[model samples]
Target: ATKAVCVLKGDGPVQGIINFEQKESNGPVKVWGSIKRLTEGLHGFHVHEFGDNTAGCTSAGPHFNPLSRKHGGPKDEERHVGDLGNVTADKDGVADVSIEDSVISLSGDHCIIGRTLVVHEKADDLGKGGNEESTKTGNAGSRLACGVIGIAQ
Candidate 1:
């Protein structure tokens, strides 16, 4: 299946592709991707609260937190539903990503297929920045890129 591409450019000079695929609906969703032309370091990434793609990303609202929880890393037990943690970019500005997540669902009340993925400008502090913004948005910087997910033929 094909995937979504981010639009509404930025200083990021960013370019990337994200695709989701799996054998079964109940199985873990595999995220296969590659990113480039970004700030050289960890870049914040997450499934935002809304699928609205009109504003590039800001219109997508905050991170997806159906449970109304504080922001945390992907590995944290209490993290927001959308917090998939940071994407590490090498010195040459390439982020190769391959992640299989157990929480993201393709079909369910909280299905993520309709959501949007947002790439941030700064590394997420994972609620350890000791401030309101840290817990509010994981201290991740402004959104640099965004794309919505949908069914592929």
Candidate 2:
């Protein structure tokens, strides 16, 4: 199995600790991360295309949805490949999240090798909003935090 780490930084410059472990099953990637928020409340969490940590996070680009699908929920029938759903902060402004992806490969084209993590200000309605299409996750609002995932030396 392979491992990767990521640092989460955003509006308040919070710190995120992420760990990715490659699995052998259909789910090739397992993600575990914690965010120590400088503020409080819910935030959207997702995987991005690029791995560059520059731009303070904006350079990561959109979610890693190679399928070009809708922005639905994590468990939605149709959604982006990078949409890992939302992470909510506790009263102390801390969020711990874990997830698994069957599509992410550690050594292939569809691999998440050069991807990133991002946090949004609002909740992803799973596209419940009448405008964005129920199958598409509603725009979760502004980006409040972000990070880059890279292999450890």
Candidate 3:
């Protein structure tokens, strides 16, 4: 059993605390969080490959894809391990996130510790956009916020 968290912050008006928990080494990870001050719409959410956000979210590199898979939705069979898909913000600019994933773990080869969580400005197309960037990014637009994942006390 283990838990982790990410305290996301942005240059603009975005901030949040995302929690991750797993009961066993190979079990699914339970994700829950609330991001504030986002525009009223869907936002791309994922685990970036790198933990560094010093150069802003751009420094986080690409989505975590140790398996070399292309981008897809959280439910897609061909999705990246980091692809948690989209989070929908309510009219009050608050997005309540709730997800359960088995591909991402707190231990083992697919461990996400020391990586980053990114919230993009727009919704993720889930790689069905029929464009070049779809397979790469889902054309989720620019990053709005990001934070490093670490073991939670």
Query: Candidates' TM-scores?
Result: 0.88, 0.84, 0.98
TM-score of 1: 0.88
Query: What stretches of model 3 exceed 4 Å from their correct place?
Result: none
lDDT of 2 at 150: 77
On the 0 to 100 scale, the lDDT of residue 113 in model 3 is 95
**What is the Cα-based lDDT of residue 28 in candidate 3?**
97
Scored by TM-score, the top model is: 3
Query: What TM-score, to 2 decimals, does candidate 2 have?
Result: 0.84
> How many Å off is the CA of 71 in candidate 1?
0.9
Q: List the residue pairs that clash in candidate 1.
A: none
- Which residue pairs in candidate 2 collide? 71-137, 72-137, 127-136, 127-137, 127-138
Worst 10 residues of 1 by lDDT: 1-10
lDDT string for model 3 (9-101, tens) is: 988999999999998567999999899999999999999999998898999999999999899999899989999999999999999999999
**Candidate 2 per-residue C-alpha lDDT over 1-153 given as tens digits, one digit per residue, 9 for 90 to 100:** 677777777767677787888855445688787888635776777778887766767787777878888777677777787777877788998887777766666656667766787777777677677684434436677666677677864
Top lDDT hit: 3
Q: lDDT score, residue 25, model 2?
A: 42
RMSD to the native, candidate 2?
2.4
